[PDB]
C-alpha cells in the first residue's frame, strides 16, 4: 500500500478536496495529501481505495468548491470505479453524492449500493431529494440504476441550468429538474459512506475528476 498522491492521475481531484473520516479516526479533515495513507484511504494496484465499516461512518472526499444548481457552466464529477463484492452483513452504503452543505443540510443526490431493496438484490440506487426536510416530511425520487457491476464502470454526475443528470457507462439513467433546490452550498463527494453494515465496505477508484 502507498499514498494515493503517489499516483499522479489522482492529483487534480486531491488538490481540490479534503478527506473526511470518523472523529475517532482523525481529528480533522485531511487537506494535505502528499505522503498520506491510512487503513481507510490508500492506494494498491495504482487505484485510490476507500474503506470504512460501521453504520453512519465514512471515508470520503469532500470537494472544496461550493456551487448552486443554477450554475451556467456544467458542474461535473466523473469516476471510473469498482464496487467489489460487499462482505456478508454490509447492507447499504453510499459511494458518490451531491451534498447540500451548510445551508442544504441533506444531500441533493446519493448514489448507493444495497443488498436488498423493494421498488431487488445487489442493486444500485440514485436518490434525488425533492426537499431538505428531515423525518417523515422528507420527499425523494428513487431511481433504480441496476445490478452492481462486477468490474469497472464509469459514473458521470452533472448539474447544469438547474438539471441533474447521471450517466452509468454512458447510459443516462437520471435526468431531473432540481431548480427547487436553491441552496448555494452544494459540492461533490466520492468514497464510502456506510448507512447500514458493521463490516468494512470498500470503494475502489481507478480515476476521479471534477470540473
Ligand atoms: O431503499 C429505500 O427505498 C428506502 O428508503 C428509505 O429512506 C431513505 C431516504 O429516502 C433517504 O434516501 C435517506 O438518506 C439519508 C442517508 O441514508 C444518510 O443517513 C444521510 O445522512 O442523509 C440522507 C438523507 O437524509 O437524504 O436514507 C433512507 C434510508 O434509510 O435508506 C426508507 O424510506 C425505506 O423504507 C426504503 O426502503
Numbering used by the authors: 27 to 145, 150 to 241
Show me the paper's own sentences about this structure.
Similar to AlyV, several PyAly mutants and two oligomeric substrates (M8 and M5) were used to determine the structures of PyAly-oligosaccharide complexes. The structures of the PyAlyH125A-M8 complex and the PyAlyH125A_Y223A-M5 complex were solved at 1.62 Å and 1.70 Å, respectively. Except for the sugar units bound at subsites −3, −2, and −1, the other sugar units of M8 were not observed in the structure of the PyAlyH125A-M8 complex, which was similar to the observation in the structure of the AlyVR91A-M8 complex. -3 subsite: The side chain of Arg143 formed two hydrogen bonds with the C-5 carboxyl group. -2 subsite: The side chain of Lys172 formed hydrogen bonds with the hydroxyl groups at the C-2 and C-3 positions. -1 subsite: The side chain of Arg159 formed two hydrogen bonds with the C-5 carboxyl group. At subsite -1, the three-dimensional position of the sugar unit in the AlyVR91A-M8 complex resembled that in the PyAlyH125A-M8 complex. However, a clear angle was observed between the two sugar units at subsite -2; that is, the directions of the two C-5 carboxyl groups at subsite -2 were different. For PyAly, loop1 consists of residues Thr108 to Lys117, and loop2 consists of residues Arg159 to Phe170. More interestingly, Lys131 from AlyV loop1 formed hydrophobic contacts with the sugar unit at subsite -2, whereas PyAly loop1 was too short to form any interactions with the sugar unit at this subsite.
In heterotrophic bacteria that use alginates as crucial nutrients, alginate lyases depolymerize alginate into alginate oligosaccharides (AOSs) and then into monomers for assimilation into the central metabolism. The overall structures of these PL7 alginate lyases are similar, showing a β-jelly roll fold composed of two antiparallel β-sheets with a deep cleft. The noteworthy structural differences among the solved PL7 structures are the loops around the deep cleft, which are variable in length and sequence and involved in alginate substrate binding with the deep cleft. Structural study on several PL7 alginate lyases reveals that two loops around the substrate binding cleft determine product distribution.
